[PDB]
Ligand binder design. Structure first.
Ligand SMILES: [Mg+2]
Ligand SMILES: [Mg+2]
Ligand SMILES: [Mg+2]
Ligand SMILES: [Mg+2]
Ligand SMILES: [Mg+2]
Ligand SMILES: [Mg+2]
Ligand SMILES: [Mg+2]
Ligand SMILES: [Mg+2]
Ligand SMILES: [Mg+2]
Ligand SMILES: [Mg+2]
Ligand SMILES: [Mg+2]
Ligand SMILES: [Mg+2]
Ligand SMILES: [Mg+2]
Ligand SMILES: [Mg+2]
Ligand SMILES: [Mg+2]
Ligand SMILES: [Mg+2]
Ligand SMILES: [Mg+2]
Lengths: 103, 117, 150, 56, 48, 110, 142
RNA sequence: GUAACGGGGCUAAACCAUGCACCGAAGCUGCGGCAGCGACGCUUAUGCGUUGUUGGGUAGGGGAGCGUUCUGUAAGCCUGCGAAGGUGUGCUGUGAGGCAUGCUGGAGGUAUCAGAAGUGCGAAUGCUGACAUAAGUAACGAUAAAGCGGGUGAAAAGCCC
RNA sequence: CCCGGCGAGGGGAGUGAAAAAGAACCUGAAACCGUGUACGUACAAGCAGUGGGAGCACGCUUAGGCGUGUGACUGCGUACC
């Protein structure tokens, strides 16, 4: 059984027991969170879809780890015009394990 | 006091050179060239951070079109149908569905058709 | 730079860079274009300001209980060992002794020891006071200091 | 008649691929004694086709 | 108590203008002069 | 066992030498020596000598059989340039390098 | 999650016989190009060759609208001084009708190695019968 | 050189009238994160419950930092159970960077908070050194010419006879 | 002691803590020139990068997958002063 959900604007496909990186959701590192933003629950033979968000669908997802990802070197630059910026960034992420898709 | 501008300079060079790894010819050795190359890469990275999203969208849309046409519908019309339905499934997800579980895609197509009619 | 006003090569003709001198700073054995001279760096210490600073530091010392006040502090012979013994008795190491009337023997004793220093009541400086973490002062010395400062 | 850019080490290496010599395929053997020699050139001693012809 | 415990007031010790220290300085390349002027060159400007 | 033989400062460019080295790269020792012998190069003699030395070392110092040995590593490396002044036409001077050569020939029965 | 990308290991290319008898050229050609690309293929990537293999037949029996039979000139250069070469559509049909179709296909596909690969998958015929019977190719109305 | 759609091609895939749509920007919005500037409730060395708003930028103006040598702090502390340096690597910062460890190195380095500066190089036909590049290319200096025998020697077109 | 010209140079043996301290002698960076291993690369055009990424190799983990290297093909993109 796999499910489709939108969280933080961006939508993600997920299966049962899959670890997917999401955005920095300000919740404890060892806590179970529920998702009602589910668009599709796919059983295998009988898929379930309704309106923008499904009526009776809840995703039980365990928070695994908070942290900052890969560092990016934001180089802004202009040729011949004496200018050079360099900013760095690591995007804050929350890794989620999905314990089960509940209907 | 006089400061010998050596060790720090070396360090400065070092990071640039390490950034310039996998660069043909002078780019992975000669500093003048190397720094330039690194800068250009950075520029491109910046651009592509903002450009790559569009490429992926183009890909996903194309995939959807391929799938839609196989099922027997034009892409724009399909999208309109989806909008009418109010289901907020994005391009990426649709593409993924098309790639793997086709029954779901078929169902989606049917729904879109219903919305249209 | 000990050298020449001779141009190493001509202005136009030759293909090389536009040469002026071997003396030029952009060279091997050239000038330090901004060479330093024997310079006085001494800042104008305002007298009143100085006084204030002294007062402040003394107050701080008092607050910290590191300013120890004595009546009788004098070494009999010019003897370092005796001084050391005295220090041990009164529990001190890093110490500035300030005296009103300078005992010579004591001063002599104070010469070699790194942590111990004896100064006259009129001959004291802020950094020295700051430096030594347990400052010891005679009553007469203290009085003299007070007179100086007001 | 002068280069306008510096050519790579790569280019130079490529050029040098032909400039490398051809090794001699194999030595030639005298049948009587067993002397190893160059092709159609005589032995070190002066033997040729199993026969000493030159003393030097 | 120590020399490493005492610190000056903020604003009392200002940074200073180092002219010609790259791009990040901002006060670099030409420092604070501009381009090709008489006022730009060293030993430049005019009398009061 | 891998036994090293070096020659340092051969009055010829390492580049020139490399050609001969390549010819006998990876070959069986006696065969390699033979190849070197009938080679028409001057650098061919130096490398041959080095090989001989290596063989000798293997025989004496280690105690290895000549038959099993192979010419593994043969890195001909660049030597210090002896800078001499050659005058040219119209008062122009060229400091011509007289490049020397390092020749490392290593031999092993494996 | 992560976007799938096509693998030449996983990509299965089927075989299609295309009849060009009494049918309009350009539209057919474009369709062929699309097929070659994989713009119909569900697992399409613009970086991996995904599309199906094509045999096209009756290159001379293709239809053109209006004056195009004599009006349309197909230009190629020799690489020489005055080596600009003129060939009308009819003329092309006369000697080698297979060329025109191929050229069209080339025009309608990417200029790179992938484009070349796609082109390779097109095998052209002036006649009605194909020799590639062992592949079991299915005829599609293009 | 087709060369006056960008090209293939197109009788619509042109051109004009109308509508439903989708794409199409680093635009707006979504989620997250960082700041700069005001309004406010409480306070302070202001943090914020916040709240809004703002955040391309050359010359140029203002503000904030990091690091290098030295100075004190420091006869302090780490350090031959391995310093500086070199070289990797892993981590960590918004950035100059910083911390940790592997190997080499074989003796010094410097916390913290200050102070002082020949302080931070990619460009000056910069200067000095090293090393490429053309390249194993042109060249080897008069077009008065060698050629053989024997000799010594590791080896002889050049040296002796 | 052996090699080689009673050469150079080397290798042993020896000295020392160390010769990865041999007079070209402390450390020994970079360019530059190399060998060996890794993967790619001989129908494919362009600031040689970037983004995407097939595969192939190699480390781990108890599976799972991640790293690292390579990058065929591919979108965009014309150095730096
Ligand atoms: Mg004069
Ligand atoms: Mg000087
Ligand atoms: Mg500015
Ligand atoms: Mg002007
Ligand atoms: Mg100027
Ligand atoms: Mg001006
Ligand atoms: Mg966008
Ligand atoms: Mg700004
Ligand atoms: Mg030092
Ligand atoms: Mg420099
Ligand atoms: Mg500059
Ligand atoms: Mg020659
Ligand atoms: Mg040439
Ligand atoms: Mg020639
Ligand atoms: Mg010649
Ligand atoms: Mg001559
Ligand atoms: Mg003779």
């Amino acid at each position: 059984m796999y499910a489709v959900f939108q969280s933080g604007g961006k939508q993600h496909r997920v299966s049962e027991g899959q670890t997917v990186r999401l955005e920095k959701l300000d919740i404890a590192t060892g806590e179970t969170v529920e998702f009602a933003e589910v668009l599709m629950i796919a059983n295998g033979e009988e898929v379930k879809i309704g309106v923008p968000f499904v009526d009776g669908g809840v995703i039980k997802a365990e928070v695994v780890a908070h942290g900052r990802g890969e560092k990016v070197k934001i180089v802004k630059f202009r040729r011949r015009k004496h200018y050079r910026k360099q900013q760095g960034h690591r995007q804050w992420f929350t890794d989620v394990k999905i314990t089960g898709i509940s209907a | 006091a006089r400061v010998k501008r050596g060790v720090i300079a070396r360090a400065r060079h070092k990071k640039i050179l390490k950034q310039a790894k996998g660069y043909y010819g002078a780019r992975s050795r000669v500093y003048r060239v190397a720094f330039q190359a690194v800068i250009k890469a950075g520029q491109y990275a910046y651009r592509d951070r903002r450009q790559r999203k569009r490429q992926f969208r183009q890909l996903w849309i194309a995939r959807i079109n391929a799938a839609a046409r196989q099922n027997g519908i034009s892409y724009s019309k399909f999208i309109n149908g989806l909008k009418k339905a109010s289901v907020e499934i994005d391009r990426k997800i649709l593409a993924d569905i098309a790639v793997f579980d086709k029954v779901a895609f078929t169902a989606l197509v049917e729904k879109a058709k219903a919305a249209l009619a | 730079v000990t050298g020449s006003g001779k141009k190493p090569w001509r202005q136009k003709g030759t293909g090389r860079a536009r040469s002026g001198s071997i003396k030029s700073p952009i060279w091997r054995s050239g000038g330090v274009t901004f060479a330093a001279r024997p310079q006085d760096h001494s800042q104008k210490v305002n007298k009143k300001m100085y006084r204030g600073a002294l007062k402040s530091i003394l107050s701080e010392l008092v607050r910290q209980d590191r300013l120890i006040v004595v009546e009788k502090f004098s070494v009999e012979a010019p003897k370092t060992k005796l001084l050391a013994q005295k220090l041990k008795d009164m529990a001190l190491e890093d110490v500035l002794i300030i005296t009103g009337e300078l005992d010579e023997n004591l001063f002599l004793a104070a010469r070699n020891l790194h942590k111990v220093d004896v100064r006259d009541a009129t001959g004291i400086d802020p950094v020295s006071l700051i430096a030594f973490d347990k400052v010891v002062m005679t009553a007469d010395a203290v009085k003299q200091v007070e007179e100086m400062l007001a | 008649a002068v280069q306008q850019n510096k050519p790579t080490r790569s280019k130079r290496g490529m050029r040098r691929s032909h400039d490398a010599l051809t090794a001699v395929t194999s030595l030639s053997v005298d049948k009587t004694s067993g002397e190893k020699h160059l092709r159609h050139h005589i032995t070190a001693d002066g033997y040729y086709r199993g026969r000493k012809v030159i003393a030097k | 108590m120590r020399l490493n415990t005492l610190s000056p007031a903020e604003g009392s010790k200002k940074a200073g203008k180092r002219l010609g220290r790259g791009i990040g300085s901002g006060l670099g390349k030409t420092g604070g002069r501009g381009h090709k002027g008489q006022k730009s060159r060293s030993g430049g400007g005019v009398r009061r | 066992m891998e036994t090293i033989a070096k020659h340092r400062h051969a009055r010829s460019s390492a580049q020139k030498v490399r050609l001969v080295a390549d010819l006998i790269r990876g070959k069986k020792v006696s065969q390699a020596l033979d190849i070197l012998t009938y080679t028409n190069k001057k650098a061919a003699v130096l490398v041959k000598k080095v090989l001989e030395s290596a063989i000798a070392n293997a025989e004496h110092n280690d105690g290895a059989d000549i038959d099993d040995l192979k010419v593994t590593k043969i890195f001909v490396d660049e030597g210090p340039s002896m800078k001499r002044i050659m005058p040219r036409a119209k008062g122009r001077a060229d400091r011509i390098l007289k490049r020397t050569s390092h020749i490392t020939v290593v031999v092993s029965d494996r | 999650m992560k976007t799938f990308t096509a693998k030449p290991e996983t990509v299965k290319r089927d075989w299609y016989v295309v009849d060009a008898t009494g049918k309009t050229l350009g539209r057919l050609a474009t369709e062929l190009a699309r097929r070659l690309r994989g713009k119909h293929k569900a697992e399409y990537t613009p970086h991996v060759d995904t599309g199906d293999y094509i045999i096209v037949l009756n290159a001379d029996k293709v239809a053109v609208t209006g004056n195009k039979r004599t009006d349309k000139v197909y230009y190629h250069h020799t690489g020489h001084i005055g080596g600009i070469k003129q060939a009308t559509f009819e003329e092309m049909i006369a000697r080698r009708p297979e060329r025109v179709i191929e050229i069209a296909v080339k025009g309608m596909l990417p200029k790179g190695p992938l484009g070349r690969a796609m082109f390779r998958k097109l095998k052209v015929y002036a006649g009605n019968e194909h020799n590639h019977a062992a592949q079991q190719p299915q005829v599609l109305d293009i």
